Structure formats: C-alpha cells, structure tokens
C-alpha cells in the first residue's frame, strides 16, 4: 500500500488531475451551479476529495501521529469543513476559497522540488533583519504622510454657498471635475496651504461658469476611488508600498505637490533611495550570501566566404518594410534564390568530400541539411516557411568559437534553472485561480481581468513584471474591498522579492563554484591640478544657467556670453602650456599619449570652431545647433582631475570585458526578433482615432467619418521601428500596450480588434523571458568577476547604579516606546475629539518616563561619563526635543498663539525620532547597516559619477527638450505642467524620474510627436536624437547602479 514505490506515481497521477480541474473553474458561468458541466465537475472534485481522505487515512494508520505530512493533514481538514458545511449558505463561496492550495501537495511529490524549497526554507530565517528595516522604512515614512498630508486629496474647486443659494442656480456640477470625472481629479490648494495648484488655475470655459469655482475645502472622495489617500496609516502603507515598487509613484507624488507643498519631492526622493533601492536589494544580497552558505572545402577562406555569405544574407533580411516598392521586393526574392543556391552548392561539395555517412557524423553538418531542404522546399513550394528563415543565422555558430564556448554556458545554466522554472509557475498558477475566485466577473470588461485561466495567467504575470500592476490594484479594492491589497503585497513579495533573488543566488552559487622648464614645474605642482578644478566648477554653474527664456537683451545673457569667453581662454591656456611642456605627440610622455589628455583636445577643439562660427551673419545655424549639443559635454573634464572618479571610471569599462560575449549575444536576438517583428506587424500598427469608432472598419471608413487615421508611436514598420520597440518591451516600461498593439492587430488599412490574434502572446512573452534570462548573467557575470579580482587581493547610588547596568531598565523603555509606536498609528483623518485628548495624555507620561531614564542614567554614571555614549546623547537630545514639542502645545492651548502652526506641525511630525531608541536594541539590524557603512569608500565614488552622469543629461536635456510644449491641439501623454526640460532644475527631476523607469515610455513618445506647422525653432531630426537620448542614459544609469550592488555584496561576502 504505502510501502510500494508506485503509490507514490499513483498519487502523483491524482495530483496532476486535481489541478486540471480546478483550472477549468470558470468564475460567473460556475457560480450558478446551474449547468450541466459544472455538475460534472463538482462530482468529479468530491471524488478525488475522497482519495485523498482515503490516503490520509491509510497513511495515519501505517505510521501513526514531517512538516509536508502536516500541510497535507490541514487540506484534508479544511477541505471537510468546506465539504461538511454544504447547506448551509452563509459564506458558502467564500469557504469554496481554500481549495487553491491543493497544488501545493506536488512539492513533496517531485524530489527536485522538495530539496528547492528546503533550501528556501532554510533561508528564510536569516531574513528577518531585513525584515526589521523594512517595519522602520514603512513605520518612519508612513506617520510623517500621514501628519503631512491626512485629508488634503479630497480637495475640490467648489461653489460659493453664498452664491449658489442667493443667485437660485443647482444646474452646474457643486464642484469643479474635468469631464473625465472623478478619474482625473482636480486637486486644489487650500488657502492655508502652499500648493502647486489652486482654485484660480481652473482653464475657462471653452457667460463662464468655470470661473466661479473658487472654494478649496474638502469633498467626499479620494483620488481613484479611495485607493490613494493619506488618511490613515492603513492607506499610507498601500501609497508607501506603490512607491517601493516604483509603479506610478510620481502620480502620489504629483497629487501631494498640487495640495501640499512643491518641496514634497524630498520626502519621495529619499523614500525612493533608503527604500526602494537599499532595502528591497538588501534583500538580494542576503539570499545570494545565504544560499552560498548552503582538402579545398577546409580551406581557411572557403570558410570565410561561406560565414560572409550568411552574414549578408542576414542583413538583407532586414531591409523591408511598410510599402515596399515592387522592385526591392524582386530583388530580395531574386538574392533569396541565389543564397539558397550557394547553401545547396556547399550542401554538395562536403556530401562528395565525406561522403553520406561521413557527412552526418559532424552535428552542425547535420544542422545545416536541415535547413536546405525547407529553403528549396519554399522555391519549389512557391509563407510560414519565410519566417523560417531567420534560423540561418544559427550557422555562425560554427565559426565563432568564443560565442559557442558562450552559448554552451547559458545552455548548461538551463540544468539548474529548470527546477525553478517548475516551481515559478506552480506559484503563477495558485495565484490565477485564487485571483478567478476573489475577482470573479467583478471588473466590470477590462483587458486586465481575471474572467478566465488564459486572461487570469496573463495578470498575474503582468503584476509580476511590475507594469501597471497599481490599475490591477484599484479595481481590486474598489470591486470586493480595500482588504483586497493584501492579494497583490503577497503577490509582489513572495514572488520578486523571494522567488527571484532565489532565481540569482542559484546562478552566482554555479557559477562561483629654458621656458620649457617652468611649465614642466607648474603642471607638476601639487596644486595645479585643483586650481584648474576650480575653475571647471565655475564652468558647470554657467552652463546649468542657461535656459530657453533667457531674453537675449538681458544682463544674464551678456554675462553668459562673456563668460563663455573667459573659459574657453583659460583652458586654452592651460592646455597650450601643457603642450609646450610635454609636447604634442613626438615624445614618448607626449600630451596626446593618454586618452584623458586626447578627450581635453577634443573639448578645447569644438570650442575654438564654436568661436570662428560666432565670429561669422551668414546661413550658418544648422552648424550652431550642433555645437551647441557638444558643448554639454565640458563637466567630463572632472574625472581626470578627481582621482577617485578615474579609477572608478576605469574600473566600470573593465567590468565590460567579462559580459562582452553576452551583450553581443543579447543585441543578436534583438535583431533577430526584430526583423520576425517587422514581418509580422509591419502597417498593421494603424488605427482610427475618434470619439466614436464603433462602426470604422477600414481606412475608408475612417476618413468618411471625418475621423484621423493615425500610427501608434511604437510600431515594427521597419528594422528601425521594431529596435525601438523592442527596447520598451525590453525595459518592462509600456510592454502591455505595445503587446495589446500586437493582439488586436488585424491588417493592413484595418482596424484592429480587441483579441484578434491571442496566439501573439508567445511573441511578446517569450522576449520578455529570453531577455531577462540574459540581462541576469549579465549582473552575474560582473559579480563573479569581481569575486575573481577580490580573491587573487554611595549607598543610595549604587542601587541606581545597578538598574542602568541591568538589562530590565533597557527593556523596559523598549516596551514604552513599542506601545508609543502603536499609540502614534492611532492618528487619522477627522478623529474624534476624545481621542485627541486621549493621544496627549498618552504623550505626557512618555515624556516623564523619558526624564526619568536620563535623571537616573546621570546619577549612575555621572555628568561627564554619561555624555560620552553616543546613545547617551541621542536620548538627551529626544528628551530636550520632547520638552520644546510639549512646551510649545501647552502655549498654543494658552491665550497667547504667537507660535506659527507649521512650527508645531513640524515638531509633531519630528517626535518621530523616538523609534531610533530601538535601532540600540536590534544589533541584528545594525551589523546588516554596518556592511553597507563599509563598502561607502567604493560606492561614495559611484555615486559622484551618477551625479556627472545626471548633469551632463540634465543640462543636454534643456537644449534638446527644452521648448516641447503641450496643449489640447498638441496633447503630450508623458509630459506635463511637473515633468519638463524647461529649465535645468526642472531636467533634473525629470532623469530621476527617467532612472526609476516610471513611464519613461510615454516622456519619449512625447518627443517623437511632429511638431505644428505654425510652431517654430522646432528641430528638424529630434526625432532621430530622442531614442539615443533616452538609450544611452537608461543602459548607462542601470549598469553604475548595478555595480553599486554588486560593490554592497563583496563586502558582505568578505566580512562572513
Ligand atoms: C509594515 C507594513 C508592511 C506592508 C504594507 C503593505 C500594504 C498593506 C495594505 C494592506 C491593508 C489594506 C487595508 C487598508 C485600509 O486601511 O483599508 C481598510 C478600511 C477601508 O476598507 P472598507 O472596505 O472597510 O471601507 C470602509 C468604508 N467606510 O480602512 C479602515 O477604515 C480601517 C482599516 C484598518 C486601518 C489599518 C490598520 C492596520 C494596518 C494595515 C493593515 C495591513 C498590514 C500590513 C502588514
Ligand atoms: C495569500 C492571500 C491572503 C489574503 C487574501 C486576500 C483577499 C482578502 C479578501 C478580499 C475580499 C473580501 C471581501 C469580499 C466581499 O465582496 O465583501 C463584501 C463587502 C462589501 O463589498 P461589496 O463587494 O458588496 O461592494 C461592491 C460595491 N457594489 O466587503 C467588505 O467591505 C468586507 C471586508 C471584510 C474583510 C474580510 C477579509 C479581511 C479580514 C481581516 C484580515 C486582517
Ligand atoms: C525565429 C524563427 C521563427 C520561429 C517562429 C515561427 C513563427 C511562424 C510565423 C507564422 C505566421 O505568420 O503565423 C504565426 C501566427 C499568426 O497567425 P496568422 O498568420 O493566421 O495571422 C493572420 C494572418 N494575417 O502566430 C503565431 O503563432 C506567432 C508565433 C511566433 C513565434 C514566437 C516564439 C518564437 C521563439
Ligand atoms: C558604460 C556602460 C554602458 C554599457 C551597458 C551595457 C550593459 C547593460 C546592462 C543593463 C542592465 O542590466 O539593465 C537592466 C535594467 C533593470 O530593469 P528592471 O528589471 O529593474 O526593470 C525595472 C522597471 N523598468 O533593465 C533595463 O534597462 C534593460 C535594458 C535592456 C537589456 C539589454 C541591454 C544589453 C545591451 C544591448
Ligand atoms: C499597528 C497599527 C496599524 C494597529 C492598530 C491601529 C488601528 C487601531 C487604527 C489604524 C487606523 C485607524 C482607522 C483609521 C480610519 C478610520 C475610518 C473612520 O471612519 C470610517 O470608518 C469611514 C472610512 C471611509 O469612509 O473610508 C473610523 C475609524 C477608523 C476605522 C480608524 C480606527 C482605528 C484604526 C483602525
Ligand atoms: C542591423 C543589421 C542586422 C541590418 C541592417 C538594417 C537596415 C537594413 C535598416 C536600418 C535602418 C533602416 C531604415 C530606417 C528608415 C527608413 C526610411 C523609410 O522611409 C523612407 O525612406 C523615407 C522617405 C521620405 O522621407 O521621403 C524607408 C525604410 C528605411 C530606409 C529603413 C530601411 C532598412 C534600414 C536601412
Ligand atoms: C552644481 C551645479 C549643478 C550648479 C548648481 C545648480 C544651479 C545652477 C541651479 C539649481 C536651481 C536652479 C534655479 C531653479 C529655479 C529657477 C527659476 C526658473 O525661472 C524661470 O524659468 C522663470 C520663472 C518666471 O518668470 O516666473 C529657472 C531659473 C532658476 C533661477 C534656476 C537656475 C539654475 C539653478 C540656480
Ligand atoms: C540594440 C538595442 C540595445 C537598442 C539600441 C538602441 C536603438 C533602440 C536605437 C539606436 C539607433 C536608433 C534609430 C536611429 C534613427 C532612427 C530614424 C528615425 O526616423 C527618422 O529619422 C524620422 C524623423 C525625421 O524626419 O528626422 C526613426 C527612429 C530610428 C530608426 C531610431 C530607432 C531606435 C534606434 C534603433
Ligand atoms: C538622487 C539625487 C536627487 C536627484 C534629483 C534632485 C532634484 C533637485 C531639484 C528639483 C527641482 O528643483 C529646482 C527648482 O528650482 C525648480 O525650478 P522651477 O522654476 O520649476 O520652480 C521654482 C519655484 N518653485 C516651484 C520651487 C516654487
Ligand atoms: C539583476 C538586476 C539587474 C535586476 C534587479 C531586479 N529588480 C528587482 C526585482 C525586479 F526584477 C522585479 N521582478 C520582475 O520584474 C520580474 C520579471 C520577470 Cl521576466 C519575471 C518575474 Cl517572476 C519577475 C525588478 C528589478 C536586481 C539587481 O539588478
Ligand atoms: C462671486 C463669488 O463667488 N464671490 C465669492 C465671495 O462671495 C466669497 O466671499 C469669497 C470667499 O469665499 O469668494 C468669492
Ligand atoms: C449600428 C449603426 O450605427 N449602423 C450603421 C448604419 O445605420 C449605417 O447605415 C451604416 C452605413 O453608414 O453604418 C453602420
Ligand atoms: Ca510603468
């Protein structure tokens, strides 16, 4: 019975069909029970129910009263619950809920499985200091949001009571709502507040009723139907945790910017640095430090004519696109034959050579038969094996060494992932029909639904990959509860925050296992090199001034001008003067022998022509557009004079050797799906844009309607399209509309159609696997290199005395303020007035227990000892601080209010600092502190270059973007009156946006859109500039802030 082997493939048999029929669960078709499949079906679970009671019942007798035993003792258990209490009504669905961990029995069936989750078991522990951090980040930012900003987002424009009432008027709408409605609220500023937008920025109407909205008091509604507010602490962690995830956190930030204070981006900056950066990758770096813890024809150019054939083969491949002309399509067909021909010609010169069995003996001899055969086969023939096509680029593997010895590794690296590919998705699949049963027919329908196993894997999936999983969210709370959150936390933490930093300790563990003489002194002295420096920092103050709104007749100008003039002789001079001393190029220590002393040569260069091109009243602008884009590039002269930054610098470009065959690997298949794109989407990506399209078919229909027939940005008409394309598919920023694109695209001069073509997901899906398979070798690649380069490197005193020394009075001050911690979450919006008072009196008795602690500490220890702790001194400073935060409400309470209210709003919000007492106690969490305190030497540098990255960008950015503007004839879907390039503050805050990839899709779309005809100093080719704008920064801000993890995680693994 249960001694046989094959019990075990028995049960496993049951397994398997107990998924299938919960899979087949259709959310409101089941829920009647009405019909006769669902009859079936129910008999069909009641039977494999009384297996599984059967098999418990045989396994409790042969061994009597393994933690996997117990997990399947609770499914029988609650399952007979769910099966004993039919009839009775109450909650009967809600019951039908528990069946989704049926699955989890597979685990201990599969041995591969059973050991994984062992592992990860056994990891879990260790994560608890992380876990500690995670209780201060949420706790910390969650009170001050909500003591910040507690109601201020059901602000609304409404009507004067006064005048509605006196004036007998009720047809307009009581306050100011755009007619979007509520899904675009308008936020204004009350009067005692100083924020972005107020009741007088309202745009007129297009004899006014808009202007009469001028009263900012509270409404009845938050932003998104409740889901976004700071009411309370519960409300505060779901805003909290959006941002963690970096999935519409500018839109928060937005909302407390037009309510609160435009100097709200700080509280967001560093939330977006301590939290969602250092925390949630500390995470990674404690999982990867546990888990390691646990005769013609061979001819040399016979070979190289037959690798250029292909090479060019490839490439003509990729030159078609939307309205081919008739002629190049001849011509492609025409080289298409002669190819073929040339294959076949090598396909019969190596059978004669070897012979037929010689022939099959080679395997990619084999590989390339194969191939033959399907291209004569589409001549002869003469669409589906066009696109078979693109595997004659698999023939150069044959010919490069160094990508097949590559290859060979991703390919092994296959082994080890597939056990964890086997349990990701048996954690997708709890989570889809778990998300059928809670979101059931409820989304009342939208793309993103969980109506059915197919559109409910696809979700969860998308939630995953972090791409608008916060729209998921709202409809989530809105439809069944705002408890519904807790689905999506678990969803988003369990699963990228555990499953895949288990996913890269599996990969790293692999792995791992007489004039003359003067200048000659002058450049050499010690202080050279910081005079010049001082003089560059000058330069970059000049060029973050400049702006497109400078007048050209103001002083400012003129003093930019001037200045330019300055700069360009001084470091003429002081690169004449090192010419002179060193020479040009004829010594061995010549000027141009190092690539620092060559990049100044270039920089003084393009400033002299800047000069002779200003000198010259001729038709000369389209060369003074250039220069002006090369002259942002003057701040990379600081890295040769900081020397901490050059080795830095040099030490990234050396970090590119080992990745090198990887990267080329990884742009090979973005040609390759690229041009498969181009074929299959190219001019399908049109559509009809209009109020109503209801009844557009076709082109012709859309013009009949007097309707715009128009392209979407992203599109795969050509190779140059689908490259851009892919990258945002790439970038997991915008990949489900352009995916959405692909679905309904149905053909040319057609409207698309909601789903036309499902079997497109694989398209799509399967690039977003592959190439995040590889971007993970990547930041492997580079940490295991790095391992590889840090290898190879009186009588009534003493009593009192005796209670300060022991432990009870440490942990007794860690119970007050635990209870002070859950005493300050008890804040919300509009509480009523006993609690208030019930809070203050609260404060009071912490206050004295406070002096106490410090009356005593003095005694025992004495003035001059007791201030030698640093501890010692944060608690003098809370305990003075907690005097002035009271001293100042009992004033305010008095007679007298000369105290201004944001001085006591500040105060309240800063007696926040009593949680710092507890970081004493938690030594877990401060060693984990400690390794990052140690690595700064290295990442302080790292991050010197992430500011000169953002400076030369941010100061492009203006010249280039600097005078998009956006209007309801030139609307802008990633731009607005928050993210501009207007000036170089504002380009600034934009590339910290563009870094966390938070809709960095649609900032570019707004770039690619064509200018108006009437508009003007509008750049003819921007459009061809934006892409390598927004590439470069996005590859070249991840790959700096990669290495400042892998900087963390050396550290870690060398101090254990
Ligand atoms: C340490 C934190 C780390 C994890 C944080 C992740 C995000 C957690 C979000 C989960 C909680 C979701 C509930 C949010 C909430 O407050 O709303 C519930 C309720 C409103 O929903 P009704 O459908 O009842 O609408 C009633 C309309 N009149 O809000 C309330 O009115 C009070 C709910 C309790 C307040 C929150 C106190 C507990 C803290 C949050 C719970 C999650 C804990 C996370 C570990
Ligand atoms: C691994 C995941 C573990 C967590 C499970 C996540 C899902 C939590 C449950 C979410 C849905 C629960 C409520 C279901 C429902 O429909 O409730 C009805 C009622 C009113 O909402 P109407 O749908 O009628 O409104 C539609 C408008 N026409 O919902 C509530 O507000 C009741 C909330 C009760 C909370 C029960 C679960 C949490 C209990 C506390 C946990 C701590
Ligand atoms: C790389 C080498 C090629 C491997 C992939 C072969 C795909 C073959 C494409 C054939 C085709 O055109 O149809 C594909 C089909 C679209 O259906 P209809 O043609 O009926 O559409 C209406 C016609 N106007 O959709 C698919 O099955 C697409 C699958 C693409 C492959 C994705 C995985 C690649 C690994
Ligand atoms: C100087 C260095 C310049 C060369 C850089 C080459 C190496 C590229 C490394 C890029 C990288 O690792 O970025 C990954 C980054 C992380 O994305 P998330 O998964 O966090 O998504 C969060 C939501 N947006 O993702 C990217 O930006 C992917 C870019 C494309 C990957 C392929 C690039 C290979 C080069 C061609
Ligand atoms: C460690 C902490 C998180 C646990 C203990 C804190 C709770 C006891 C606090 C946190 C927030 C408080 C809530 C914040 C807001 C509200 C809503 C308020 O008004 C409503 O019920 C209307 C709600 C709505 O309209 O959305 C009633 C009190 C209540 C439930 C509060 C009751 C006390 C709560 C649950
Ligand atoms: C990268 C390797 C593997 C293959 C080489 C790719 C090329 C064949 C691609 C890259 C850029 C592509 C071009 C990008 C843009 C255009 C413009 C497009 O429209 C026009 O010619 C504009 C006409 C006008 O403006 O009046 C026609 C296709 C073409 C030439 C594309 C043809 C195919 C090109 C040359
Ligand atoms: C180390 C480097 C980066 C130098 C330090 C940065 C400064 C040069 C930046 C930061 C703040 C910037 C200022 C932020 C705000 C404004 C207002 C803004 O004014 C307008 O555009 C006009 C407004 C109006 O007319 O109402 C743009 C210029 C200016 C002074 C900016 C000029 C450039 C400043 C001083
Ligand atoms: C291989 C992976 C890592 C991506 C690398 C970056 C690409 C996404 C970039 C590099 C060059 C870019 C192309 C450079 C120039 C053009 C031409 C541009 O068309 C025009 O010039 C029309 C505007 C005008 O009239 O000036 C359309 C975008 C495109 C194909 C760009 C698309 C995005 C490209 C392929
Ligand atoms: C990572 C490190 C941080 C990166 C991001 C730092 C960004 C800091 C500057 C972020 C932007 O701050 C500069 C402001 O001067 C903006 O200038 P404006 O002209 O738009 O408005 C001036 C007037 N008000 C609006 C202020 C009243
Ligand atoms: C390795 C790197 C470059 C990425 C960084 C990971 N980092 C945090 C988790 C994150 F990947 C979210 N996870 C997904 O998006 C995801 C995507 C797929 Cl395809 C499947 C699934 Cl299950 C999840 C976002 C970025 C960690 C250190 O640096
Ligand atoms: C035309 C109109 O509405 N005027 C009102 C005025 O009556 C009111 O006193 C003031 C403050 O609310 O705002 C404005
Ligand atoms: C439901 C609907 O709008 N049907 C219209 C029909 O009335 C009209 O005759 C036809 C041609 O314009 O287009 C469609
Ligand atoms: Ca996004």
């Known amino acids: 019975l249960v001694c046989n082997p094959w019990f075990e493939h028995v049960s496993m048999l049951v397994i398997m069909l107990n998924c299938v029929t919960l899979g087949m669960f259709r ?10 499949r669902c009859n079936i079906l129910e008999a069909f679970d009641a039977f494999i129910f009384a297996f599984f009671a059967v098999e418990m019942v045989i396994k409790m007798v042969a061994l009597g009263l393994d933690t996997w035993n117990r997990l399947d003792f609770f499914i029988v258990v609650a399952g007979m619950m769910e099966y004993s209490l039919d009839g009775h009504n109450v909650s009967l669905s809600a019951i039908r809920t528990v069946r989704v961990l049926r699955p989890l029995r597979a685990i ?3 041995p591969s499985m059973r050991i994984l989750v ?9 994560l608890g200091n992380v876990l500690l951090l995670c209780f201060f980040v949420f706790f910390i930012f969650g009170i001050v949001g909500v003591q910040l900003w507690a109601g201020l987002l059901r602000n609304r424009c409404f009507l004067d009571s006064a005048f509605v009432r006196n004036n007998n008027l009720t047809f307009l709408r009581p306050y100011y ?4 409605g509520e899904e675009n609220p308008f936020i204004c500023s009350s009067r005692r507040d100083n924020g972005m937008q107020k009741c007088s920025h309202i745009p007129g109407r297009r004899i006014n009723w808009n202007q009469y909205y001028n009263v900012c008091r509270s409404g009845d509604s938050n932003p998104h139907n409740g889901a976004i507010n700071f009411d309370n602490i519960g409300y505060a962690w779901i805003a909290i945790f959006q941002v963690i995830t970096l999935e519409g956190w500018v839109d928060i930030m937005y909302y407390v910017m037009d309510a609160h204070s435009f100097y709200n981006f700080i509280y967001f900056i560093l939330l977006i640095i301590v939290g969602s950066f250092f925390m949630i990758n500390l995470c990674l770096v404690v999982i990867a430090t546990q888990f390691s813890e646990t ?5 040399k150019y016979f070979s190289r004519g037959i690798m250029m054939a292909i090479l060019v083969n490839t490439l003509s491949m990729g030159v078609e696109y939307h309205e081919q002309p008739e002629e190049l399509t001849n011509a492609l067909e025409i080289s298409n034959i002669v190819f073929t021909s040339m294959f076949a010609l090598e396909m019969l010169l190596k059978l004669l050579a070897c012979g037929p069995l010689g022939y099959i003996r080679n395997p990619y001899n084999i590989f390339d038969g194969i191939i033959v055969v399907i291209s004569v086969w589409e001549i002869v023939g003469q669409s589906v094996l066009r696109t078979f096509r693109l595997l004659r680029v698999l023939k150069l593997v044959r010919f490069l060494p160094a990508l097949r010895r590559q290859l060979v590794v991703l390919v092994k690296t296959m082994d080890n992932v597939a056990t964890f590919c086997t349990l990701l998705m048996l954690f997708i699949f709890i989570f889809s029909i778990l998300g059928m049963h809670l979101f059931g027919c409820k989304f009342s329908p939208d793309r993103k639904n969980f109506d059915s196993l197919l559109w409910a894997i696809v979700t969860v999936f998308q939630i995953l990959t972090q791409e608008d999983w916060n729209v998921v969210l709202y409809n989530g709370m809105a439809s069944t509860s705002s408890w519904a959150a807790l689905y999506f936390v678990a969803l988003m933490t369990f699963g990228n925050y555990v499953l895949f930093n288990l996913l890269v300790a ?4 692999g792995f791992q296992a007489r004039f003359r003489v003067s200048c000659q002194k002058v450049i050499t002295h010690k202080m050279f090199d910081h005079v010049v420096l001082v003089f560059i920092f000058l330069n970059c103050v000049t060029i973050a001034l400049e702006r497109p709104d400078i007048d050209p007749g103001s002083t400012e100008r003129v003093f930019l001008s001037v200045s330019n003039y300055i700069f360009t002789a001084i470091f003429v001079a002081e690169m004449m003067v090192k010419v002179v001393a060193l020479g040009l190029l004829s010594g061995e220590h010549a000027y141009l022998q190092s690539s620092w002393n060559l990049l100044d040569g270039l920089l003084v260069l393009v400033s002299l022509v800047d000069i002779v091109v200003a000198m010259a009243g001729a038709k000369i602008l389209g060369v003074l557009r250039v220069l002006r884009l090369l002259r942002t590039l003057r701040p990379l002269r600081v890295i040769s004079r900081a020397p901490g930054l050059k080795l830095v610098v040099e030490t990234l470009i050396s970090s590119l050797r080992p990745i090198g065959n990887i990267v080329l690997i990884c742009c090979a298949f973005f040609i390759i799906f690229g041009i498969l794109g181009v074929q299959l989407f190219k001019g399908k990506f ?17 013009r009949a309607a007097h309707y715009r027939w128009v392209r979407r940005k992203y599109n795969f008409d050509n190779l140059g399209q689908a490259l851009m394309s892919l990258f945002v598919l790439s970038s997991k920023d915008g990949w489900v509309n352009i995916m959405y694109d692909g679905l309904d695209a149905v053909g040319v001069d057609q409207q698309p159609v909601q789903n036309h073509n499902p079997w497109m997901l694989l398209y799509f899906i399967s690039f977003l696997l592959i190439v995040s398979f590889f971007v993970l070798n990547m930041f492997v690649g580079v940490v295991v290199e790095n391992f590889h380069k840090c290898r190879q490197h009186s009588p009534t005193r003493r009593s009192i005395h005796s209670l300060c020394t022991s432990h009870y009075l440490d942990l007794f001050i860690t119970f007050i303020i635990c209870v002070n911690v859950i005493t300050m979450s008890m804040e919300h919006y509009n509480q009523p007035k006993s609690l208030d008072e019930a809070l203050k009196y609260c404060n009071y008795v912490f206050t004295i227990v406070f002096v106490f602690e410090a009356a005593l500490k003095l005694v025992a220890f004495g003035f001059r000892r007791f201030f030698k702790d640093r501890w010692n001194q944060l608690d003098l400073a809370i305990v003075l601080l907690s005097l ?9 309470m008095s007679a007298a209010l000369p105290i201004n209210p944001t001085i006591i709003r500040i105060m309240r919000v800063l007696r926040i600092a009593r949680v710092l007492k507890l970081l004493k106690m938690a030594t877990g969490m401060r060693a984990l502190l400690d390794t990052v305190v140690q690595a700064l030497p290295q990442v302080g540098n790292l991050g010197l270059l992430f500011m000169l990255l953002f400076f030369i960008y941010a100061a492009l950015g203006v010249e280039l973007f600097g005078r998009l503007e956006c209007s309801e004839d030139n609307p802008c879907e990633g731009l607005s009156r928050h993210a501009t390039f207007s000036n170089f503050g504002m380009a600034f805050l934009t590339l910290f946006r563009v870094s966390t990839g938070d809709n960095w899709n649609g900032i570019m779309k707004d770039t690619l859109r064509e200018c108006s005809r009437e508009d003007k100093h509008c750049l003819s080719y921007l459009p061809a500039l934006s892409p390598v704008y927004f590439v470069t920064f996005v590859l070249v801000a991840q790959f700096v802030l990669v290495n400042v993890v892998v900087a963390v995680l050396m550290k870690h693994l060398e101090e254990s």
């Open 27 to 36: 959310p409101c078709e089941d829920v009647e029970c009405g019909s006769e």
């Open 108 to 110: 201990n069936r599969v």
């Open 118 to 126: 062992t592992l990860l078991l056994d990891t879990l522990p260790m």
């Open 177 to 180: 709502q755009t007619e979007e």
């Open 295 to 299: 005769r013609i024809v061979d001819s």
């Open 506 to 509: 599996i990969l790293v563990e």
């Open 686 to 702: 049109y559509y009809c844009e209009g109020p109503d399209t209801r009844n557009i078919s076709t082109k012709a229909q859309c």
């Open 884 to 892: 002035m935060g009271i001293t100042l409400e009992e004033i305010e």
